Amino acid sequence: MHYLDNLLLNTDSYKASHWLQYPPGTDASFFYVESRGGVYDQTAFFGLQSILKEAINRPVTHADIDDAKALLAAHGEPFNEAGWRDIVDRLGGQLPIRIRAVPEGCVVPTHNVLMTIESTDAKAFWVPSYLETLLLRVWYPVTVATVSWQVKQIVRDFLQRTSDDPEGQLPFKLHDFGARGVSSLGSAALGGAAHLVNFLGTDTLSALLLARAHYHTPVAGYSIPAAEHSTITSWGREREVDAYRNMLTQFARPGAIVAVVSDSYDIYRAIREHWGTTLREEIIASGATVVIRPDSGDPVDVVEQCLLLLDEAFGHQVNGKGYKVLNHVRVIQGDGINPQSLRAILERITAAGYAADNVAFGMGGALLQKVDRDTQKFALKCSAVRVDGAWIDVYKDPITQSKRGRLTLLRDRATGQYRSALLDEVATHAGDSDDALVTVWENGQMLREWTLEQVRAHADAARL
Amino acid sequence: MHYLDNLLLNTDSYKASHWLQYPPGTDASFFYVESRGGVYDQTAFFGLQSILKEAINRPVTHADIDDAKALLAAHGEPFNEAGWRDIVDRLGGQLPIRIRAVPEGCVVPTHNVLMTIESTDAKAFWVPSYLETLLLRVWYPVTVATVSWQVKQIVRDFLQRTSDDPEGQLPFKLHDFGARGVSSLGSAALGGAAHLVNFLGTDTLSALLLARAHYHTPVAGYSIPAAEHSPGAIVAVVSDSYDIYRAIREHWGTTLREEIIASGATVVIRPDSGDPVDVVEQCLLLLDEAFGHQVNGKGYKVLNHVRVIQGDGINPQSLRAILERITAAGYAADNVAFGMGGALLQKVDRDTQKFALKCSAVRVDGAWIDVYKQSKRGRLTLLRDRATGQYRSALLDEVATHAGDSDDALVTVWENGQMLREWTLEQVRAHADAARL
Ligand SMILES: NC(=O)c1ccc[n+]([C@@H]2O[C@H](COP(=O)(O)O)[C@@H](O)[C@H]2O)c1
Numbered sequence: 061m062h063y064l065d066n067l068l069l070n071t072d073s074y075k076a077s078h079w080l081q082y083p084p085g086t087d088a089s090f091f092y093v094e095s096r097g098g099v100y101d102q103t104a105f106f107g108l109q110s111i112l113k114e115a116i117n118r119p120v121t122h123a124d125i126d127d128a129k130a131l132l133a134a135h136g137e138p139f140n141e142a143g144w145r146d147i148v149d150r151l152g153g154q155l156p157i158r159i160r161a162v163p164e165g166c167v168v169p170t171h172n173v174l175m176t177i178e179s180t181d182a183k184a185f186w187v188p189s190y191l192e193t194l195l196l197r198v199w200y201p202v203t204v205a206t207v208s209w210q211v212k213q214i215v216r217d218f219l220q221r222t223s224d225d226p227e228g229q230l231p232f233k234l235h236d237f238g239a240r241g242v243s244s245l246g247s248a249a250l251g252g253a254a255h256l257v258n259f260l261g262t263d264t265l266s267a268l269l270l271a272r273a274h275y276h277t278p279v280a281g282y283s284i285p286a287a288e289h290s291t292i293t294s295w296g297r298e299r300e301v302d303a304y305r306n307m308l309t310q311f312a313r314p315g316a317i318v319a320v321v322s323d324s325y326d327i328y329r330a331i332r333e334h335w336g337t338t339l340r341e342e343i344i345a346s347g348a349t350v351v352i353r354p355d356s357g358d359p360v361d362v363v364e365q366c367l368l369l370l371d372e373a374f375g376h377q378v379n380g381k382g383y384k385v386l387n388h389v390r391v392i393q394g395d396g397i398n399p400q401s402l403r404a405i406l407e408r409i410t411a412a413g414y415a416a417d418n419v420a421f422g423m424g425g426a427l428l429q430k431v432d433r434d435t436q437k438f439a440l441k442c443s444a445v446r447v448d449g450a451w452i453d454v455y456k457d458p459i460t461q462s463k464r465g466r467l468t469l470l471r472d473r474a475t476g477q478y479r480s481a482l483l484d485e486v487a488t489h490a491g492d493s494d495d496a497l498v499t500v501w502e503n504g505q506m507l508r509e510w511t512l513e514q515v516r517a518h519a520d521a522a523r524l
Numbered sequence: 525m526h527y528l529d530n531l532l533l534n535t536d537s538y539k540a541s542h543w544l545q546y547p548p549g550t551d552a553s554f555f556y557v558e559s560r561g562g563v564y565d566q567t568a569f570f571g572l573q574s575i576l577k578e579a580i581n582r583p584v585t586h587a588d589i590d591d592a593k594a595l596l597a598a599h600g601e602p603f604n605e606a607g608w609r610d611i612v613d614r615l616g617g618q619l620p621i622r623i624r625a626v627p628e629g630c631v632v633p634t635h636n637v638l639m640t641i642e643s644t645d646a647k648a649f650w651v652p653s654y655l656e657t658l659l660l661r662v663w664y665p666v667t668v669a670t671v672s673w674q675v676k677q678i679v680r681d682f683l684q685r686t687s688d689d690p691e692g693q694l695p696f697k698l699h700d701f702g703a704r705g706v707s708s709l710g711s712a713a714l715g716g717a718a719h720l721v722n723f724l725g726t727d728t729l730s731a732l733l734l735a736r737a738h739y740h741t742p743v744a745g746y747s748i749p750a751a752e753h754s755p756g757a758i759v760a761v762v763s764d765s766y767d768i769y770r771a772i773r774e775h776w777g778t779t780l781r782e783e784i785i786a787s788g789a790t791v792v793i794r795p796d797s798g799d800p801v802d803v804v805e806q807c808l809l810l811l812d813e814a815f816g817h818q819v820n821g822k823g824y825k826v827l828n829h830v831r832v833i834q835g836d837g838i839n840p841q842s843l844r845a846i847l848e849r850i851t852a853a854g855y856a857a858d859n860v861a862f863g864m865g866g867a868l869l870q871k872v873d874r875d876t877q878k879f880a881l882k883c884s885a886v887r888v889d890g891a892w893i894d895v896y897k898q899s900k901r902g903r904l905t906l907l908r909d910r911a912t913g914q915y916r917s918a919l920l921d922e923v924a925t926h927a928g929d930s931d932d933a934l935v936t937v938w939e940n941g942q943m944l945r946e947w948t949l950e951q952v953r954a955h956a957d958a959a960r961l
Contacts, residue, residue, distance in 0.1 A: 251707065284601075293896070303547070
């Protein structure tokens with residue numbers, strides 16, 4: 061929104077004053093971004109394109125400078141007015157930086173250069189450090205994309221073992237429910253979009269809006285009509301079955317998919333007590349796939365139970381792998397899902413003989429909110445400065461061998477393995493490796509740009 | 525940004541399909557928000573005003589409907605085109621709802637009505653539930669404001685025991701360093717603002733912009749420059765426990781100290797390594813050796829010329845552990861401040877305070893009926909007991925019957941396109957500050 065538009069105020073306060081802290085005769089700076097470890101050994105890189113389009117969407121102006129000079133003096137921070145005025149007057153307000161990055165969607169082992177930021181102007185060498193705050197927030201779409209990607213590898217494994225069509229099934233197995241459980245609208249759009257790197261099912265409309273505006277994708281994902289807790293109960297307990305039948309009247313057509321929520325005990329009652337008998341026929345006659353979502357009881361146990369109970373209500377087919385596929389009905393567990401309980405469910409149900417085709421998984425806050433900058437120990441570090449015309453390495457520990465100097469990422473041509481290297485070694489090892497980064501942004505201009513489909517192809521091709 | 529400027533698409537996909545799921549003859553609905561428990565026993569209510577100003581900043585338009593209709597059909601959801609067109613053509617595109625809420629800054633025990641949402645138009649009764657997704661996100665400013673307020677009560681306790689000016693010291697004792705570690709710019713602005721409900725110090729400039737645009741506050745908070753070491757009243761310098769020790773014993777430290785006192789500025793040391801508790805106590809012990817102290821009127825030591833801010837590993841537990849160690853060591857709580865970043869602005873979720881928005885009543889065939897899973901149900905509100913200030917939840921019909929003992933504690937903040945009751949941040953700060961454990 062409009063009150064946040066000024067780029068000069070999109071930073072931590074203390075970093076506005078960093079230009080005064082450089083040695084005299086400093087001429088240039090070079091930064092890199094990496095995951096220093098954390099929950100997973102590899103990260104799907106995603107979201108930088110959206111961050112750049114949204115946070116650097118116009119030249120800096122004199123009005124930006126006036127506003128930032130006034131606020132920062134009152135707030136108590138020094139502000140390099142003359143430095144910003146020169147950038148506006150001489151460089152047309154375009155940030156004199158070059159950003160290189162691994163193509164979005166690639167999956168890269170931890171401890172590797174994911175992007176570099178370099179100054180492209182001697183006077184305005186300090187601009188990269190000014191952008192650390194907004195750039196380091198790339199940790200969020202990277203981490204969400206990674207969590208979603210890791211779940212995809214678990215689901216893909218079980219579909220490969222138990223499904224006749226594992227890649228036809230896989231895009232719909234993890235559904236984003238996190239729009240209400242995430243901390244703002246912008247994070248819903250960006251984290252939801254990061255999920256869509258790996259799957260097609262989402263209820264986070266904001267992610268469609270971002271994918272459409274920033275990743276050239278008119279309709280990045282899909283969903284289905286689904287019942288709410290509130291709507292069912294408000295019919296009253298004496299007409300509760302009529303609420304479910306109305307779901308069928310409104311949405312159940314051949315080839316259509318409709319979800320209904322119910323607590324686990326009512327599901328058991330409906331299959332035992334024969335008032336659900338007319339619900340079964342209307343379900344069967346509809347030709348629709350009715351997805352049942354249990355919303356009480358143990359997240360793992362209840363899936364297996366629903367499968368067994370629905371099997372006796374609706375029957376099953378045995379597929380080519382020897383696993384049962386229920387007729388007409390499916391189960392989605394939307395509660396308590398994380399990579400461990402998800403794996404537990406899949407282990408439980410396939411051991412019971414049910415194909416992974418039968419179940420889907422909803423994740424909300426656990427996908428979009430329960431991540432932080434430490435999940436993958438994200439860092440954005442200075443690695444080199446040019447002083448008195450000479451580049452000097454910048455680092456803290458000499459060990460982690462530690463990354464220093466002007467850096468890039470290499471991909472080995474035969475194996476596809478990644479490794480970080482000095483820009484000095486992109487020759488030399490030509491023949492065995494190619495430079496895996498690309499220039500995505502330079503001096504106010506976005507250069508290399510991806511569609512979400514291009515992002516999806518990198519992520520889908522990556523395996524554990 | 526502009527690509528998110530369509531309220532019809534600020535919701536969960538399935539809510540597009542929802543108006544068809546009510547029983548026939550439904551013509552009103554009623555919802556309330558509460559914390560169902562979690563980490564703390566009470567929540568500081570904050571952020572709804574920002575959410576409404578941003579998420580409902582204009583009347584819905586026909587362009588909004590065209591856009592939503594096309595996207596939702598392709599996405600796979602039905603779309604109540606006629607219902608939205610009616611809201612545009614008949615109601616000027618203003619949402620027919622009434623939102624009531626406890627004044628922002630109030631601190632309310634869990635399991636209580638914090639806000640209510642009611643429909644005000646028979647034909648458009650389904651709008652409150654459409655808005656659940658964006659309204660329930662109020663959990664985030666509430667929870668940041670609560671974590672920040674819970675910390676404040678801890679520091680306050682130790683300042684009342686050890687400081688000669690507890691309430692003058694308190695507003696600077698928790699600083700926000702959270703902008704790198706939060707998921708987005710908008711979260712940074714809103715969560716940063718939620719912290720400023722309780723304190724004055726922040727490095728999250730985005731929070732100043734939100735407070736200025738949404739809470740009528742030009743300069744909501746302050747900071748000091750920080751020499752990272754590889755007017756000017758106060759300065760932060762980064763260090764470690766051993767570094768201070770080496771300065772004391774190496775001769776470059778006696779001229780280092782000469783410069784510090786000759787400058788007459790207060791130096792704030794931030795250690796960035798070591799056990800949070802041990803490193804604060806040791807820095808204090810070494811800084812006392814180097815610069816001396818005064819004994820304040822409670823008998824605790826206040827260092828000359830130096831302060832310590834611990835910005836690493838801070839949470840309500842380590843924070844208290846620190847305060848306990850230094851005060852047992854005889855040091856006043858004046859000497860130290862605390863920084864939180866992602867631990868404040870990011871490491872919270874909707875389950876921290878178990879936030880929920882629930883339908884409690886619908887009108888069907890003329891008659892109101894309760895909706896529920898003893899349970900809270902019906903058309904609800906919050907009461908404040910007039911003598912004790914204690915809150916409880918009640919049915920609207922009970923307000924008059926207890927008018928002698930209590931007042932209705934909600935206010936109407938928003939109705940039919942118009943914000944009514946509206947707060948400055950200083951009013952919010954006053955409610956939070958008056959509340960105690
Ligand atoms: N289409 C749907 O049924 C839908 C959409 C969004 C959220 N939800 C529900 O909202 C809850 C989300 O919980 P969390 O966001 O805290 O994970 C879950 O119960 C989820 O099932 C359901």
